[PDB]
Every structure is written in structure tokens, then in C-alpha cells.
Amino acid sequence: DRMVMGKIKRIEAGLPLTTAKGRTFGYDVIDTKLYINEEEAKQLRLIYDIFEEEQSITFLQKRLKKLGFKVRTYNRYNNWLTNDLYCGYVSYKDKVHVKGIHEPIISEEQFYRVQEIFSRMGKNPNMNKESASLLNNLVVCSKCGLGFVHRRKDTVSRGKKYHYRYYSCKTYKHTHELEKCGNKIWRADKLEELIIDRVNNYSFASRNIDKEDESLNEKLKIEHAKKKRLFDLYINGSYEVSELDSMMNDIDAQINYYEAQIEANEELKKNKTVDFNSLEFREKQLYLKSLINKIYIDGEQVTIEWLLEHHHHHH
DNA sequence: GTTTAGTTCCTCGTTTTCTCTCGTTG
DNA sequence: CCAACGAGAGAAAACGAGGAACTAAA
Ligand SMILES: [Ca+2]
Ligand SMILES: [Ca+2]
Ligand SMILES: [Ca+2]
Ligand SMILES: [Zn+2]
Ligand SMILES: [Zn+2]
Ligand SMILES: [Zn+2]
């Protein structure tokens, strides 16, 4: 017990909890504290970068190998890309969480960016399988609520072989574990070009502005308001006859700077991923995942629930 | 000629689960 | 050595969107 209260105290003091041998990659253990291991520290930076690129531990393992790096087990890399020990923190099973006394090896940002990658990879099962379909994990059934799965079916007659790609609710694949819901079964090629269509339109739409949202001409006005507030001021208390001209002429050469600026800034404006279809496959689905949250399907009608809103005003 | 469907096994990255062992603590 | 125990490393089993055949209706 009292020893336990001690371990806790040791952690709250900023010291590392796990100090076992070879369970501290990128850190050497001296005394009971850990200090950066230049060598392994480098590998973590490389790992952390590559991963942030590929967004796949396996993909990572494949690359590392090619680079002549000794490759470790999947879970080991999963731990290193997770676990804030590498970005500075020390923890104690939910009871204690605080910045430790060791040199972090990863930026608190690049950390939480990677943690972001795992977050999404979570909500999108198999999105990294080579068989991941363009609209993977994006389509849901308005009937029964489960989501759609991509299906394929092929048969031949004579010598001609037939292939077909659909997107059916799960109730139409797991016939045994659940009964049908009556919602449509879509032709992949369609649903897709359909969605791609709204996505291009939507994309094109965003980008363009409201006049209210777009000073070099709004200050041109400030001076006009000065010559106002100034003259009338003179009629009351104000300034002396002379203090008036020494000033009113300033805002004028000030006007001319702006009028020449404005009329001139005119001419040089008078005389003056958006391409989805070009993106490789994986990048396409990723693009979608970033731009679309959910595609609801109701028989014949589909409703895209965008993720990113637009800049302009709506009604 | 074309599709729509049901069985009955695969795939293969990511996730869980579950022992082994380390080792700091008063 | 006491006693308690959190959690990486590893091995192995579980997940789950998708797949390949072949067969029998529509
Ligand atoms: Ca102490
Ligand atoms: Ca942790
Ligand atoms: Ca159009
Ligand atoms: Zn359904
Ligand atoms: Zn808009
Ligand atoms: Zn309005």
C-alpha cells in the first residue's frame, strides 16, 4: 500500500513508470530516469514521419525494411506511435497524467496529428485493405441504420464473363445473422459517379465571396469623414484659422495618395485536389473521407452529409 | 444474352486478448 | 526479501470490409 502511494508519488513527481530493459525505445535508462538515446531517437523521428505519410503501420514496416532497417512486430510500432511518453508525458493508469522530466523526442503537435490518424483509422475498418472501396465506411442505410458494404459478384455464360459491383445494406449480405430491410441495392459505378458529381459541384461552389467578407478604399472614406469632423469642429471651439489649413491640406495630399492608389490599383486587376479524377485511388477515398462525413441512402435518394461547410452565406 | 442470388470458403490489415517478466516502492 | 501491480513485448486468436467460384433462377 504505502509503497503504492509511493509509486504514484514518483510518477506525480515526473518520473517514468515503465523503466524495464528494452521497453524504453529511444531512451537509455540511467539511475531510474530516462535520457535520450541519440540512435533510437532518430529512428523514432523517421518512423513518426513515414507513418504520418503512409498512415499505415504495415505500409511503414514495408518501407523500413527496404531501407535496411531491422523491422519489429506490428504492435511495437503501434505503441511508439501512440503513448505520449514520446512527446513528453508520464502517466499512471488514469490516476496520474503529467509532463515528465525527460527530453521529449516528438513534438506535441506531430504527436496529436498522428493520434489523429489513428482516430480516423478507427472509425473506418479496413480502410487500409487493398480492397477498400471508394465509398468505404461512408454509406449508411436509412432503414435499420446499419451501413452499406461494397459487394461484387461475377459469373460467366458461354465464354463471356460477367462482373458486377454493388453497394448493399448489411442486411443483404448477412442473410443468416439478420433479415433484410427493403432498402435499395446500388450499382457501384452509379452511386460513385453520383457522389463524385455532388463532390465536384460542391467543391466548385465553395470558393467565391460575399462583398461583406472581402480598406484601401474604406480609408479613402476616413479622410472624407475627417474633413467633415474637422470643418464643423472649427465653427465651435476648435482650432485657430491657421491650424485648420495646415491640417485640411494634409488629409488632401492624403486623399490624392489614395485616389491615385485606388484608380491605379484598379487597372492591374482589370487588365488581369480540385481535380479529383486525377488523384490516385487511395488518395481519392481519403479526399472523400476528409470532405464527406456520411452518405445516407434511402432507396432512390441519396443525401450527402458534408463534413466541411462553405465560406459564404446560405438560406 | 444479362442480371439477380445463395452457398461455402478465402483475404489480410488492424485489434484484442492473454501470458511473461521486469522492477520501483517505503 | 516483503508485497503489489502497471504495462511493454510477443504470440495468437478475433475483427470485418471485401473477394472468388460455381450454381440456379429470373
Ligand atoms: Ca525519493
Ligand atoms: Ca498509455
Ligand atoms: Ca455538374
Ligand atoms: Zn438497412
Ligand atoms: Zn455555399
Ligand atoms: Zn440571409
Numbering used by the authors: 134 to 347, 350 to 407, 418 to 460
Pull verbatim passages from the article behind this deposition.
The large serine recombinases (LSRs) are DNA-rearranging enzymes that are members of the serine recombinase superfamily. Many LSRs are bacteriophage integrases (often referred to as serine integrases) whose function is to integrate the phage genome into a host chromosome by using short specific DNA sequences, or ‘attachment sites’, in the virus (attP) and in the host (attB). The LSRs share a catalytic domain with the smaller resolvase/invertase enzymes, and there is a strong consensus that the LSRs use the same mechanism of strand exchange.
We crystallized the LI integrase CTD (residues 133–452) bound to a 26-bp A118 attP half-site and determined the structure using anomalous scattering data from selenomethionine-substituted protein and intrinsically bound Zn ions. The integrase CTD is composed of two structural domains: a mixed α/β ‘recombinase domain’ (RD) and a zinc-nucleated domain (ZD) containing an embedded CC motif that extends away from the RD and the DNA. The construct used for crystallization contains part of the helix (αE) that connects the N-terminal catalytic domain (NTD) and RD and is involved in formation of the subunit rotation interface during strand exchange.
